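User: Modeling request: complex.
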Amino acid sequence: WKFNRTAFLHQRQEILQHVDVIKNFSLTKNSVRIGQLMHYDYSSHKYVFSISNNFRSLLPDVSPIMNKHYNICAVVGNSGILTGSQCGQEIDKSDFVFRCNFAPTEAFQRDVGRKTNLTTFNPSILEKYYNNLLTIQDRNNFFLSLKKLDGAILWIPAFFFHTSATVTRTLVDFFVEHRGQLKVQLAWPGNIMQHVNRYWKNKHLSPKRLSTGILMYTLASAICEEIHLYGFWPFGFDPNTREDLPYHYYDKKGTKFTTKWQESHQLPAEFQLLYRMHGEGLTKLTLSHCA
Amino acid sequence: WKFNRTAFLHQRQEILQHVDVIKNFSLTKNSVRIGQLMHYDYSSHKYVFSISNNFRSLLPDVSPIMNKHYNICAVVGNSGILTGSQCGQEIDKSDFVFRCNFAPTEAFQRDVGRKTNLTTFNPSILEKYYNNLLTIQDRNNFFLSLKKLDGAILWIPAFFFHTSATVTRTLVDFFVEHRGQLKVQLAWPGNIMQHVNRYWKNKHLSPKRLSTGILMYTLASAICEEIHLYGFWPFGFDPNTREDLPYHYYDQLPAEFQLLYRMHGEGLTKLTLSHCA
Ligand SMILES: *[C@@H]1O[C@H](CO)[C@@H](O[C@@H]2O[C@H](CO)[C@@H](O[C@@H]3O[C@H](CO)[C@@H](O)[C@H](O)[C@@H]3O)[C@H](O)[C@H]2NC(C)=O)[C@H](O)[C@H]1NC(C)=O
Ligand SMILES: *[C@@H]1O[C@H](CO[C@@H]2O[C@@H](C)[C@@H](O)[C@@H](O)[C@@H]2O)[C@@H](O[C@@H]2O[C@H](CO)[C@@H](O)[C@H](O)[C@H]2NC(C)=O)[C@H](O)[C@H]1NC(C)=O
Ligand SMILES: *[C@@H]1O[C@H](CO)[C@@H](O[C@@H]2O[C@H](CO)[C@@H](O)[C@H](O)[C@H]2NC(C)=O)[C@H](O)[C@H]1NC(C)=O
Ligand SMILES: *[C@@H]1O[C@H](CO)[C@@H](O[C@@H]2O[C@H](CO)[C@@H](O)[C@H](O)[C@H]2NC(C)=O)[C@H](O)[C@H]1NC(C)=O
Ligand SMILES: *[C@@H]1O[C@H](CO)[C@@H](O[C@@H]2O[C@H](CO)[C@@H](O)[C@H](O)[C@H]2NC(C)=O)[C@H](O)[C@H]1NC(C)=O
Ligand SMILES: *[C@@H]1O[C@H](CO)[C@@H](O[C@@H]2O[C@H](CO)[C@@H](O)[C@H](O)[C@H]2NC(C)=O)[C@H](O)[C@H]1NC(C)=O
Ligand SMILES: Nc1ccn([C@@H]2O[C@H](COP(=O)(O)OP(=O)(O)O)[C@@H](O)[C@H]2O)c(=O)n1
Ligand SMILES: Nc1ccn([C@@H]2O[C@H](COP(=O)(O)OP(=O)(O)O)[C@@H](O)[C@H]2O)c(=O)n1
Ligand SMILES: *[C@@H]1O[C@H](CO)[C@@H](O)[C@H](O)[C@H]1NC(C)=O
Ligand SMILES: *[C@@H]1O[C@H](CO)[C@@H](O)[C@H](O)[C@H]1NC(C)=O
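Assistant: Request completed. Predicted assembly structure:
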């Protein structure tokens, strides 16, 4: 594998022609009005969400990636290929590390690293893992999780799925209540998928829904000089050993591979395109143990 | 049935010496702090709700019932005993009418009246009847429902059950969003059940939980000269025929009922169990 910087920069420029990444990265205070009704990228149009004073107060003033530049970036997907890879040190050497869905690192650092500079966060995490912040203990656990992120960007897409609606108020209220107590940089993308979908539709990838991993690639393209991908491997066997693999690296040993998404996604089609991109030197896809 | 004003005035005085009704009626802006953690009267202590700026902004400045005095009050429970009663006109002749849980009147006026001066509102009503205000149509329907109340009090107990927590944020955000567009007067009781329970504990009624109906009686005792109860009949069978009756007219309560029946017999209050006409 040898990086082709020219072709990567061309890709960047092509992405930027279709998606204003710096802007799309997050709503800002001055781009929303109090009382504005948002709709959801992936739900029926009837679902709405009214922007409150408090929601607006958590938006950044300027794009958190404006005038930011990182030389080597790691984008870490969640594939079971990472278990046993020992990629953690190599991942953490990156200038900037992107992670998906608040993925755990604690038990897994040797394989996936501990550096996090951005992690994505669907609001429904609060429902699944923090009991809607109903108790003192829930609130404390969520607070600690956030504190461990230090100054990283928490990239919260509250306008993709309508089922985010009522949990988003809880999350907004939690952050307003704790204003100034955490260093996490909040980012809140708006209705961006139609713009992102345009670039990838031209590359002959058009599922109903693009994966978080490729969305992160798209964002990374604008601010990273060189992108190294880890944990992109949507298959139940290891490419080198042929052994069974789980879907996620944090799945217990012996978990059988079963696909998270059907119909809505085309992870194999994503992977194939990224693999082609690897071959063209646009990005480095890692599929084996790290030295 | 004949009112015993003497004994009623004695009851009022006893209730007031155990429960500060005017204060307990609603939290006020200055009685909470932003960031204060509320607990729930009927849930485990571990459940909390943080008071926001916005929640506080919806509290009244002063108890809405301070220095209010009404002559005849109706407290209207939701029993199916009201179906066919034709009590609407008699209920609406009251000076002040208390209703429970935002109960519908329009299709049932002949039996239950259309006068409303206070109605209670469990936040979970948004979940059951207004789809968490997720769509435009839901928001419009809830707005129209609130507008029909005009200047009545909407008495919202958000701190009895922890299952109110998440819907309460939706309700708060809806009211902030619509600030100044409705005339409804909001009231928000806090942790009052242990204080209300004290009076009723001495009357040998001590469930787990007092019902909204008897909570409304209690409040009424402070601002009414005479209280007439309707729709209190916690049984699935008609008192006279024993044929099935629904629970609600718009479809330990028996101990409460027994006490209210005894109170009727003492002339404290009038419990209507039959047709008005
Ligand atoms: C995500 O980025 C896209 C662009 O990739 C943003 O869409 C763009 O929004 C701007 C609004 O400033 C549009 O500019 C306007 O163009 C018209 C001419 O077509 C001009 O008359 C106006 O004065 C203005 O310059 C631009 O057209 C539009 N591009 C597309 C393809 O729709 C989008 O706003 C971003 N979304 C978020 C939530 O950040
Ligand atoms: C930005 O990074 C490039 C590339 O760095 C190399 O590849 C990375 C994946 C990682 O393994 C690095 O340690 C490698 O050095 C840098 O370009 C290299 O610069 C070094 C040190 O001066 C030089 O010896 C190499 O020949 C260069 N390699 C290439 C491919 O150009 C570049 O210097 C970095 N710039 C900054 C400001 O950090
Ligand atoms: C880096 O990638 C670019 C773009 O794909 C390569 O440039 C192409 O080179 C082939 C050689 O036959 C031509 O057919 C294309 O038309 C070229 N395109 C452009 C824009 O130059 C380049 O060869 C790659 N570099 C390396 C070192 O492999
Ligand atoms: C990316 O995030 C990591 C934390 O994951 C940052 O690295 C830490 O930086 C602090 C403050 O300088 C150090 O004291 C820690 O020792 C570092 N931790 C690790 C795990 O490396 C890093 O600075 C961030 N990079 C950015 C924002 O470019
Ligand atoms: C409801 O009214 C009661 C009094 O009937 C209030 O109880 C008093 O509260 C103060 C302040 O906490 C205590 O110091 C007193 O000891 C309490 N008195 C009694 C008799 O218990 C209560 O605070 C009111 N609650 C609300 C929410 O309004
Ligand atoms: C109690 O509530 C009723 C409304 O349900 C009030 O009666 C209305 O008063 C307005 C203004 O005078 C009239 O235009 C309406 O026609 C009345 N409606 C009905 C159904 O009577 C009543 O004034 C309130 N009483 C108190 C004491 O506040
Ligand atoms: N077996 C897997 C699992 C995830 N992935 C990638 O890793 C990302 C993070 O995984 P996830 O399961 O948490 O992601 P989503 O369900 O949000 O897409 C995905 O969006 C994919 O791009 C993969 O390539 N192979
Ligand atoms: N069949 C019934 C229904 C309601 N009720 C009373 O009417 C009140 C209002 O009814 P509800 O069922 O809407 O009230 P909750 O107690 O459920 O808040 C109850 O609290 C009871 O005091 C009754 O006595 N008999
Ligand atoms: C009114 O109630 C009091 C208190 O129990 C009683 O002594 C009095 O005789 C009652 N009057 C009636 C039933 O007329
Ligand atoms: C209260 O209601 C009674 C009974 O209808 C009535 O006769 C009386 O005049 C009313 N007013 C006052 C001030 O008591």
